[PDB]
């Protein structure tokens, strides 16, 4: 149960903050879990999604064992687009269907210097937390 008096548990306040968070909070919010192999390798559970990571779709009409590369991340709509998930409209042109990152798992990451810095920081903090828990 929350005991900090300076953080709110009000439903309307939380929803307002969620729906008007700025883009650099949207990046934090749209994070998705790593695969089992990546989790065991990096000792990290979740990672904010980037432009060209690939994904397994876990829930929804498009769940399956297809590795799909993300094409772009629409933070305004809280959505990512995957190069394989898509549907054709009336005229026949094909448009991407939005998938929320929370229903998404990374197969392997795009290892940029900032990405590996973030991974090492997360792993170090988790390991020191576990060592304190010892």
């Amino acid at each position: 149960m929350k005991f900090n008096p300076f953080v709110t548990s009000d439903r309307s306040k939380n929803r307002k903050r969620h729906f008007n968070a700025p883009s650099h909070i949207r990046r934090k919010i749209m994070s998705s879990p790593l695969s089992k192999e990546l989790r065991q390798k990096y000792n990290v559970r979740s990672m904010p999604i980037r432009k060209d990571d690939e994904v397994q779709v876990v829930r929804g009409h498009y769940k399956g064992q297809q590795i799909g590369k993300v094409v772009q991340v629409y933070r305004k709509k809280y959505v990512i687009y995957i190069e394989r998930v898509q549907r054709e409209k009336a005229n026949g042109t094909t448009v991407h269907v939005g998938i929320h990152p929370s229903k998404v798992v990374i197969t392997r990451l795009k290892l940029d210097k900032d990405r590996k810095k973030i991974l090492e920081r997360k792993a170090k903090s988790r390991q020191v937390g576990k060592e304190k828990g010892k």
């Binding site: 149960m1 548990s9 009000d10 439903r11 309307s12």
Partner: protein
């Protein structure tokens, strides 16, 4: 409500004539809200009848002796299996409902230890019942931070906090109370008496110092003693079925005499 809600406008009644209902009306202007009826409880918009005021008598005071009497009654009723079961608590496996454990549990630090202790004492069925009872509240209370409701679980009375509160904090339905600071609001949830309670050895020892015996006053309180019994032998079955009262009775007329 706001002290000036409904009175923000400036309106006068058109008065006799004009074939209108003789009520204040928004004056002038080329707007829908013009000549519409401003004040009064019967008008759209406008003031409520008898606006609620912040200086309502929200709080009440109860006599200290009455509070202590209620606490004593709740404590006494918590020791009767019939009342505790009728409160809904599942205690059919509990070895002894005035449940007392040693002071070693007062130093528990992890939730797993508390869960194991509950399983050993066979009170885990009440926690399972609470888990099953966890549901969604009905009505407009959902949009007012009262989204989720659940059943009350057992109470745990301790004497010193040595991680006891942290250990049992996360288990749903468990209510922790210090033995020196009991409150009726948690001892008798609902106004109904007979909540299931689990005592520690130190708290059980301190009980009779807190509230005194029949022949000894309470040491920790200034001058308090247990409330006197109005009737001692409350076994009505005996009081009827005893020879000395049955002797002084007339024969029971039990033949019906219909019209």
């Amino acid at each position: 409500v706001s002290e000036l809600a409904g009175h923000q406008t400036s309106a006068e009644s058109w008065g006799t004539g004009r074939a209108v209902a003789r009520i204040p009306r928004v004056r002038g202007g080329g707007t829908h809200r013009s000549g519409q009826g401003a004040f009064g409880n019967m008008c759209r918009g406008g003031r409520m009848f008898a606006p609620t005021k912040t200086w309502r008598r929200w709080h009440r005071r109860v006599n200290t002796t009455q509070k202590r009497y209620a606490i004593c009654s709740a404590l006494a009723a918590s020791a009767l299996p019939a009342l505790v079961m009728s409160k809904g608590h599942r205690i059919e496996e509990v070895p002894e409902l005035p449940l007392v454990v040693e002071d070693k549990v007062e130093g528990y630090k992890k939730t797993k230890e508390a869960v194991l202790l509950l399983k050993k004492l066979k009170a885990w069925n009440d926690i399972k019942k609470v888990y099953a009872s966890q549901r969604m509240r009905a009505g407009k209370g959902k949009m007012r931070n009262r989204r989720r409701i659940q059943r009350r679980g057992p109470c745990v009375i301790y004497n010193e906090d040595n991680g006891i509160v942290k250990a049992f904090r996360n288990i749903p339905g468990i209510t922790l109370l210090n033995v020196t600071k009991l409150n009726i609001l948690k001892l008798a949830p609902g106004g109904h008496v007979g909540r299931f309670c689990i005592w520690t050895e130190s708290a059980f020892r301190k009980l009779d110092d807190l509230y005194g015996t029949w022949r000894k006053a309470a040491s920790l309180k200034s001058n308090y003693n247990l409330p006197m019994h109005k009737m001692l032998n409350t076994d009505l079955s005996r009081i009827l079925k005893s020879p000395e009262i049955q002797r002084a009775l007339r024969a029971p007329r039990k033949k019906i005499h219909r019209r």
